[PDB]
Amino acid sequence: VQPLATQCFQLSNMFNPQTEEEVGWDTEIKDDVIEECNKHGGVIHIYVDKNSAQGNVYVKCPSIAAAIAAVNALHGRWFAGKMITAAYVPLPTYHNLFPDSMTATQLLVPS
């Protein structure tokens, strides 16, 4: 079936490294996704994989409810004719990839 929601997710189609042209684009994505999450349930870890051919961004939220809200805000937007899609990532998989996220529990809410 479709996998169950978790605290962690992967967005796809957020960018295309071959066509991005603005200096600082990957940080702009990071900061934008933080701002969007802070209109919903917040965020505790984020990584923009700027090398990814699939336009992947990785996010960990403080709860499953917060992740659902972020996923529902971001998926279904369209960039260059491709849809932003989300896949939930199992916690052990996410933590293997981003070990700094394992102990993070406070929200990224810019001062």
Coordinates of C-alpha atoms in Angstrom, one line a residue:
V1 CA 0.0 0.0 0.0
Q2 CA 1.0 3.7 0.4
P3 CA 3.5 4.1 3.3
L4 CA 2.4 5.6 6.6
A5 CA 3.3 9.2 7.6
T6 CA 6.4 9.7 9.7
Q7 CA 8.2 12.7 11.1
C8 CA 10.6 12.8 8.1
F9 CA 10.1 13.3 4.4
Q10 CA 11.8 13.8 1.1
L11 CA 10.5 16.3 -1.4
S12 CA 11.3 15.8 -5.0
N13 CA 11.3 18.2 -8.0
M14 CA 12.1 21.3 -6.0
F15 CA 14.9 22.3 -8.3
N16 CA 16.9 21.1 -11.2
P17 CA 20.7 21.6 -10.7
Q18 CA 21.3 21.7 -14.4
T19 CA 19.0 24.8 -14.9
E20 CA 19.3 26.7 -11.5
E21 CA 20.9 30.0 -12.3
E22 CA 20.6 32.2 -9.2
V23 CA 23.7 32.5 -6.9
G24 CA 22.6 31.1 -3.5
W25 CA 19.6 29.2 -4.9
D26 CA 20.0 26.2 -2.6
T27 CA 20.1 28.3 0.6
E28 CA 17.1 30.3 -0.7
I29 CA 15.2 27.0 -0.9
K30 CA 16.2 26.0 2.6
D31 CA 15.1 29.3 4.0
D32 CA 11.8 29.3 2.1
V33 CA 10.9 25.8 3.3
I34 CA 11.7 26.8 6.9
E35 CA 9.4 29.9 6.4
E36 CA 6.6 27.7 5.0
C37 CA 7.0 25.1 7.8
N38 CA 6.7 28.0 10.3
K39 CA 3.2 28.7 8.9
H40 CA 2.3 25.1 9.9
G41 CA 4.0 22.9 12.5
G42 CA 7.6 23.9 12.3
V43 CA 10.7 22.0 11.5
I44 CA 13.7 20.7 13.3
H45 CA 16.2 19.6 10.5
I46 CA 16.4 20.4 6.8
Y47 CA 18.9 19.5 4.1
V48 CA 18.8 20.6 0.4
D49 CA 20.7 18.1 -1.6
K50 CA 22.0 20.6 -4.2
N51 CA 23.6 17.8 -6.3
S52 CA 20.4 15.8 -6.6
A53 CA 19.2 15.3 -10.2
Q54 CA 15.7 14.7 -8.7
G55 CA 15.6 18.0 -6.8
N56 CA 15.5 16.4 -3.3
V57 CA 15.0 18.2 0.0
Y58 CA 15.0 16.3 3.3
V59 CA 12.9 17.5 6.2
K60 CA 12.4 16.4 9.8
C61 CA 9.5 17.9 11.7
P62 CA 8.7 17.8 15.5
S63 CA 5.8 15.4 15.1
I64 CA 4.0 13.3 12.5
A65 CA 1.1 15.9 12.6
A66 CA 3.6 18.7 11.8
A67 CA 5.1 16.6 8.9
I68 CA 1.7 16.0 7.4
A69 CA 0.9 19.7 7.5
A70 CA 4.2 20.6 5.8
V71 CA 3.8 17.8 3.2
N72 CA 0.3 19.0 2.4
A73 CA 1.5 22.6 2.0
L74 CA 4.3 21.8 -0.3
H75 CA 3.3 18.8 -2.5
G76 CA 1.1 19.6 -5.4
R77 CA 2.9 22.8 -6.4
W78 CA 4.3 22.8 -9.9
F79 CA 7.7 23.9 -10.9
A80 CA 8.7 24.0 -14.6
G81 CA 5.8 21.5 -15.3
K82 CA 6.9 19.0 -12.7
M83 CA 4.9 18.4 -9.5
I84 CA 6.5 18.7 -6.1
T85 CA 6.1 15.3 -4.6
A86 CA 6.7 14.0 -1.1
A87 CA 7.7 10.6 0.3
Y88 CA 7.8 9.8 4.0
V89 CA 11.2 8.4 5.1
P90 CA 11.5 5.9 8.0
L91 CA 13.2 7.3 11.0
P92 CA 16.1 4.9 11.1
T93 CA 16.9 5.6 7.4
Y94 CA 16.7 9.4 8.0
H95 CA 18.9 9.2 11.0
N96 CA 21.5 7.1 9.2
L97 CA 21.8 9.7 6.5
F98 CA 21.6 12.7 8.9
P99 CA 23.0 11.7 12.2
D100 CA 22.8 15.3 13.6
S101 CA 19.0 15.1 13.3
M102 CA 18.8 12.3 15.8
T103 CA 19.2 14.4 18.9
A104 CA 17.6 17.6 17.5
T105 CA 14.3 18.5 19.3
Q106 CA 14.0 22.3 19.2
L107 CA 12.3 24.1 16.5
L108 CA 14.1 26.2 13.8
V109 CA 12.2 29.5 14.4
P110 CA 14.4 32.3 13.3
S111 CA 15.1 34.9 16.0

